Every structure is written in structure tokens, then in C-alpha cells.
Ligand binder design. Sequence first.
Ligand SMILES: N#CNc1nc2ccccc2[nH]1
Ligand SMILES: N#CNc1nc2ccccc2[nH]1
Ligand SMILES: N#CNc1nc2ccccc2[nH]1
Ligand code: NI
Length: 341
Amino acid sequence: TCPFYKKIPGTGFTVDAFQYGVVEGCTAYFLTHFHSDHYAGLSKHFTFPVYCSEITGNLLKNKLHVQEQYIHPLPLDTECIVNGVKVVLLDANHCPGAVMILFYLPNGTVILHTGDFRADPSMERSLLADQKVHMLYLDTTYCSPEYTFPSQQEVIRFAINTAFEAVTLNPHALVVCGTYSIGKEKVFLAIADVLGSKVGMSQEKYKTLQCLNIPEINSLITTDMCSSLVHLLPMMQINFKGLQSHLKKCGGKYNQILAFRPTGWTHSNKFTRIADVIPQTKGNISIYGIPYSEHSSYLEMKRFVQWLKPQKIIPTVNVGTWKSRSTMEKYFREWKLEAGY
Ligand SMILES: N#CNc1nc2ccccc2[nH]1
Ligand SMILES: N#CNc1nc2ccccc2[nH]1
Ligand SMILES: N#CNc1nc2ccccc2[nH]1
Ligand code: NI
């Protein structure tokens, strides 16, 4: 049954709560983004209203086959009334279609639910700049100071330069990129763009990416693998055995593979700067792990929260252990005492 931190008090609303059957009192189910832990439970048989972005709605219809009558897309940055309550969707700087939700409760309380997000100073000039937020439901994925990583821009610079150098030295090299969900599309699109190639992939992944309704992405994708020198594969295949096996299938077109595994944070970020990163190599196959995050660093999160000055914080990630909960609560108090709210 549905946990407390997925319920919006004083409303009939839940957020990212599709795996609990019918939720008692829920008149509308919000979905922040199309990632499996959040949508878990949705299908063609779902018969309650779903509120989400246009992009999330495209994915619900085409990938999970939710019936069109139950899909309620809302535009971003626009005041909307849902079951007698004013709501706003804001871009979360996470994966495509991902939103934060502002709820204006009838009693005068204002609640921000971040969904999953990567906090940025640009959010300090959204529709958030006006008004007070009483409660914040916060993506606390990396809420500890050990979690550091580069900007997305620096990581893409490293990837483009690495790929361009390798293929300029060896015109017969293949670039492979790993994927298990939507998000992080810039990695493979930026590499294909510098190499003058389209990105080749399965029919299933092409369809998933087609549901994002964006011409720029559409010009750079294909299902014709043979005509492409940047290939996408499932993340589980990005290992020496899986890549060896893939290389056999290309029919003596290539004699080297350079592969990228976009991860989140890993312990190596404690030690090694992005510019100094080196691959794992076996024979004619090299694999780079690159720290491309779509969640806030500790410092990004702290800056956002200290700016917003919420009266109460409810974490939505790392909620299962007393150690985690106690650590997060200590940081929230430090931030409050330093900033004076
Ligand atoms: N909206 C949205 N997501 C989005 N749009 C893109 C355009 C180019 C490359 C990656 C992209 N991701
Ligand atoms: N001759 C020549 N160019 C060339 N071929 C390579 C294959 C693998 C790695 C580096 C290489 N450079
Ligand atoms: N302070 C702190 N960390 C912490 N608090 C706990 C409470 C119960 C079990 C493990 C725990 N770890
Ligand atoms: Ni997510």
C-alpha cells in the first residue's frame, strides 16, 4: 500500500504511485517522468486520470499502451486547474519530459514536489521566484558531501574529443554507447554529430526515442545499423564479452571498438578528475565509464534548498534506513542554520 511521502495532503492527489493498486481517496495520479521505478504498475488496463507532461504522455500511449481517454498532458510554466486545485509543471532538468509539480492548496499552503531533478541556478528565475513554499518533497539521491561530479558540459566535451580523436586516428573504429532507459541522450547524439554519423539502434529503442517528439533527435537516429558508426546497445552488453560478440556481427567493417558507459557517481570520482579519466582495455576493445549525472550534486542541492527556504523538507530517495534518514536530517538543519531561515 501507498507510502505517506507519495500523498499530497488536503488533496485527492498522489505522485508516482502506480504500484499499489487503487489508492483510497485518490482522484488523480500524477507521473513526474517515464522512469521504471516511478511508473511501475501502469498499463492498458489503467482506468484513472493520469496527469503528466506531453512527452511522458507520448510514452504512456505508445510504450505502455495506456488508453488516450485517461492521459491528461499539461503544458509547462502554465497555471492549470485540476479537480479544483491550481497546479504548475516546471522542467526538472532530468530526462526528457521530466517535471517538478507546484501545488497551491485551498488552505493557502504551497507545496513543491521536485520528482527527480538536477538543480540549477536557472530554477531561481522560474515561476518559483514569486512565492513562498511551505513543504518541499526533495530528490535526495546524492544528499551527502562525498557526492561530487563534473558539469554535463565538461563530460560531453571529454566524450566528443575522445571519440573524434580515436576515429580520426583509425577510420575503421566503431563507437558503442550503453543505454537502459530514457535520459542522457546528449552523450550519443553529441558523439554522432561530431563524427557525421547517425546513431544506430534496435527497433524498440528507435520507437522509445520516436515518442520524444523532437526533430533534432529524429534526424540523428536510424534502425539501419550497417549505415552508422555510432551504435546503441543495452547497458548490460557494455563489457568485453558483449562487445566482442557485437563486433563479429558487423561483417568485417570494423577492427576496433571504443565504448562509453554513462553511469551516475562512482567512487573513482573521489580520486580522478574527468580530464584524467582512462579506459579499461582488452585487445582492440576499450571501455570508458563517464560520470554523466541527471541528479543534483550535494552542492547543487544545497544551493537550491538554501535559496528556496522551505519550512519543511520530505525526502523521496534513500528513505529506507535510519542511518540515511538521520544523515539527511542533519544536513537539512546545517543548511537552515547557515542560511538563517
Ligand atoms: N525536451 C527534451 N529533451 C531533449 N531534447 C534534445 C535535443 C537534442 C539532444 C538531446 C535532447 N534531449
Ligand atoms: N596505421 C594506422 N592507423 C591506426 N590504426 C589503428 C588501429 C587501432 C588503434 C590505433 C590505430 N592507428
Ligand atoms: N545518527 C545516526 N545514524 C544512525 N541512526 C540510527 C538509528 C537506528 C539504526 C541505525 C542508525 N544509524
Ligand atoms: Ni529518474
